[PDB]
Structure formats: C-alpha cells, structure tokens
Design a protein around this motif. Structure first.
Motif, PDB file in Angstrom:
ATOM      1  N   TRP A   1      -4.843   0.929   8.060  1.00  0.00           N
ATOM      2  CA  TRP A   1      -6.025   1.614   8.573  1.00  0.00           C
ATOM      3  C   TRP A   1      -5.721   2.298   9.903  1.00  0.00           C
ATOM      4  O   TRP A   1      -6.457   3.181  10.333  1.00  0.00           O
ATOM      5  CB  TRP A   1      -7.202   0.628   8.715  1.00  0.00           C
ATOM      6  CG  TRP A   1      -8.226   0.753   7.619  1.00  0.00           C
ATOM      7  CD1 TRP A   1      -9.580   0.808   7.774  1.00  0.00           C
ATOM      8  CD2 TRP A   1      -7.983   0.859   6.205  1.00  0.00           C
ATOM      9  NE1 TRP A   1     -10.192   0.934   6.552  1.00  0.00           N
ATOM     10  CE2 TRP A   1      -9.235   0.966   5.575  1.00  0.00           C
ATOM     11  CE3 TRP A   1      -6.829   0.874   5.411  1.00  0.00           C
ATOM     12  CZ2 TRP A   1      -9.370   1.086   4.195  1.00  0.00           C
ATOM     13  CZ3 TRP A   1      -6.966   0.991   4.039  1.00  0.00           C
ATOM     14  CH2 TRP A   1      -8.227   1.095   3.445  1.00  0.00           C
TER      15      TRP A   1
ATOM     16  N   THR B   1      -6.177   8.698   0.418  1.00  0.00           N
ATOM     17  CA  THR B   1      -6.532   7.881  -0.741  1.00  0.00           C
ATOM     18  C   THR B   1      -5.359   6.966  -1.095  1.00  0.00           C
ATOM     19  O   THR B   1      -4.200   7.346  -0.912  1.00  0.00           O
ATOM     20  CB  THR B   1      -6.911   8.752  -1.967  1.00  0.00           C
ATOM     21  OG1 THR B   1      -5.904   9.753  -2.199  1.00  0.00           O
ATOM     22  CG2 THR B   1      -8.266   9.429  -1.772  1.00  0.00           C
ATOM     23  N   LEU B   2      -5.650   5.758  -1.574  1.00  0.00           N
ATOM     24  CA  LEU B   2      -4.603   4.790  -1.905  1.00  0.00           C
ATOM     25  C   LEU B   2      -4.102   5.004  -3.333  1.00  0.00           C
ATOM     26  O   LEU B   2      -4.795   5.604  -4.157  1.00  0.00           O
ATOM     27  CB  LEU B   2      -5.136   3.356  -1.749  1.00  0.00           C
ATOM     28  CG  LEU B   2      -5.685   2.999  -0.354  1.00  0.00           C
ATOM     29  CD1 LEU B   2      -6.285   1.592  -0.349  1.00  0.00           C
ATOM     30  CD2 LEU B   2      -4.593   3.123   0.706  1.00  0.00           C
TER      31      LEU B   2
ATOM     32  N   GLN C   1      -5.419   1.935  -7.063  1.00  0.00           N
ATOM     33  CA  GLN C   1      -6.776   1.468  -6.789  1.00  0.00           C
ATOM     34  C   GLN C   1      -7.022   1.396  -5.287  1.00  0.00           C
ATOM     35  O   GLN C   1      -6.088   1.212  -4.504  1.00  0.00           O
ATOM     36  CB  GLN C   1      -7.008   0.083  -7.419  1.00  0.00           C
ATOM     37  CG  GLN C   1      -7.111   0.097  -8.941  1.00  0.00           C
ATOM     38  CD  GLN C   1      -8.347   0.831  -9.441  1.00  0.00           C
ATOM     39  OE1 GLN C   1      -9.413   0.237  -9.601  1.00  0.00           O
ATOM     40  NE2 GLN C   1      -8.218   2.126  -9.691  1.00  0.00           N
ATOM     41  N   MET C   2      -8.278   1.542  -4.890  1.00  0.00           N
ATOM     42  CA  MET C   2      -8.662   1.439  -3.486  1.00  0.00           C
ATOM     43  C   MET C   2      -9.580   0.243  -3.280  1.00  0.00           C
ATOM     44  O   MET C   2     -10.413  -0.064  -4.136  1.00  0.00           O
ATOM     45  CB  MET C   2      -9.367   2.718  -3.010  1.00  0.00           C
ATOM     46  CG  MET C   2      -8.505   3.970  -3.094  1.00  0.00           C
ATOM     47  SD  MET C   2      -9.255   5.389  -2.267  1.00  0.00           S
ATOM     48  CE  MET C   2      -9.309   4.817  -0.568  1.00  0.00           C
ATOM     49  N   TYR C   3      -9.408  -0.437  -2.153  1.00  0.00           N
ATOM     50  CA  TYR C   3     -10.270  -1.556  -1.783  1.00  0.00           C
ATOM     51  C   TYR C   3     -11.630  -1.054  -1.268  1.00  0.00           C
ATOM     52  O   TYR C   3     -12.668  -1.615  -1.622  1.00  0.00           O
ATOM     53  CB  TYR C   3      -9.578  -2.443  -0.733  1.00  0.00           C
ATOM     54  CG  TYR C   3      -8.239  -2.996  -1.193  1.00  0.00           C
ATOM     55  CD1 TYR C   3      -8.160  -4.190  -1.903  1.00  0.00           C
ATOM     56  CD2 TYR C   3      -7.054  -2.317  -0.924  1.00  0.00           C
ATOM     57  CE1 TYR C   3      -6.943  -4.690  -2.329  1.00  0.00           C
ATOM     58  CE2 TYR C   3      -5.835  -2.813  -1.346  1.00  0.00           C
ATOM     59  CZ  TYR C   3      -5.784  -3.998  -2.049  1.00  0.00           C
ATOM     60  OH  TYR C   3      -4.572  -4.489  -2.474  1.00  0.00           O
ATOM     61  N   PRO C   4     -11.659  -0.006  -0.404  1.00  0.00           N
ATOM     62  CA  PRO C   4     -12.917   0.620   0.020  1.00  0.00           C
ATOM     63  C   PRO C   4     -13.416   1.650  -0.997  1.00  0.00           C
ATOM     64  O   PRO C   4     -12.616   2.295  -1.686  1.00  0.00           O
ATOM     65  CB  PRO C   4     -12.526   1.300   1.333  1.00  0.00           C
ATOM     66  CG  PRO C   4     -11.110   1.710   1.116  1.00  0.00           C
ATOM     67  CD  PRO C   4     -10.493   0.630   0.259  1.00  0.00           C
TER      68      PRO C   4
ATOM     69  N   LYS D   1     -15.705   1.033  -3.603  1.00  0.00           N
ATOM     70  CA  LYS D   1     -15.803   0.440  -4.937  1.00  0.00           C
ATOM     71  C   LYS D   1     -16.901   1.125  -5.749  1.00  0.00           C
ATOM     72  O   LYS D   1     -18.020   1.307  -5.260  1.00  0.00           O
ATOM     73  CB  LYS D   1     -16.095  -1.065  -4.835  1.00  0.00           C
ATOM     74  CG  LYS D   1     -15.032  -1.852  -4.074  1.00  0.00           C
ATOM     75  CD  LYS D   1     -15.403  -3.329  -3.956  1.00  0.00           C
ATOM     76  CE  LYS D   1     -14.350  -4.126  -3.193  1.00  0.00           C
ATOM     77  NZ  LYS D   1     -14.737  -5.556  -3.039  1.00  0.00           N
TER      78      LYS D   1
ATOM     79  N   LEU E   1       0.820  -1.218   0.000  1.00  0.00           N
ATOM     80  CA  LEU E   1       0.000   0.000   0.000  1.00  0.00           C
ATOM     81  C   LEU E   1       0.853   1.266   0.000  1.00  0.00           C
ATOM     82  O   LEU E   1       1.911   1.328   0.631  1.00  0.00           O
ATOM     83  CB  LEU E   1      -0.946   0.030   1.221  1.00  0.00           C
ATOM     84  CG  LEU E   1      -2.179  -0.890   1.141  1.00  0.00           C
ATOM     85  CD1 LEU E   1      -2.985  -0.836   2.435  1.00  0.00           C
ATOM     86  CD2 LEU E   1      -3.056  -0.519  -0.055  1.00  0.00           C
TER      87      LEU E   1
END
Length: 109
Positions: A84, A100-101, A104-107, A109, A30
């Motif tokens: 987190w 922000t990641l 792409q972000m996992y949360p 969607k 990450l």
C-alpha cells in the motif's frame, strides 16, 4: 478495444512464468498491474517508470518491474509489507496512477 490483447495474452504468459517459478520453489511442477498512461506512447511510461525505479529501488525494495505496453507498467512484489506504500506513491502523483492486483484483489470485494 485496443492494446488489451497484450494485457490478456502477454500478461498471462509473463505471470505464468512467475507462477511456475513459485511452483518450482513449492517443489513440484502480491503483483500489480498499474495503468499509468492508457496511451501507447511508451515515452510517458519511460519517464514515469524511470522515476518509480529511482524511487523504489533507491530505498531497496524486493520488487521487479517490466515496462511493456504503455497502458500498464507491471510490478512484482516479493514483499507485500510496503504494498500500500508503493500503491500510495503511485496514487500520490499529479496525474495519478491506477493500480490493480494480479488475479484477485483484497479491497473492492
């Protein structure tokens, strides 16, 4: 429009290095963008990121941080366990930081 130029271009170039290093580790040729101030005044990001350093690097985290463009401070995590947790710390603040990641972000969607 404003400052986003460094975001797009300079973040692309910066992370591209990390990509290539991870590729070199892959053996062939990450991470988080944190909108803190949204204001070019480097002074804000100086103070706040100073706190973040004294906090994160005090508990010894496998992370690295670069302060370019007071809009966003960038944090590369070699360990995503406390992802987190650091994020929580950033949002746990008075003015609160926006995290922000990379890619792409996992949360969300």
């Amino acid at each position: 429009g404003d400052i986003r130029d460094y975001n797009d271009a300079d973040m692309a170039r910066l992370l591209e290095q990390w990509e290539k290093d991870d590729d070199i580790e892959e053996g062939d040729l990450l991470m988080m963008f944190v909108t803190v101030s949204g204001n070019p005044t480097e002074k804000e990001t100086e103070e706040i990121t100073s706190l973040w350093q004294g906090s994160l690097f005090n508990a010894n985290y496998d992370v690295q941080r670069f302060i370019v463009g007071s809009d966003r401070a960038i944090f590369m995590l070699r360990d995503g366990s406390y992802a987190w947790e650091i994020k929580d710390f950033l949002v746990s603040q008075d003015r609160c930081a926006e995290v922000t990641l990379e890619g792409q972000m996992y949360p969300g969607k």
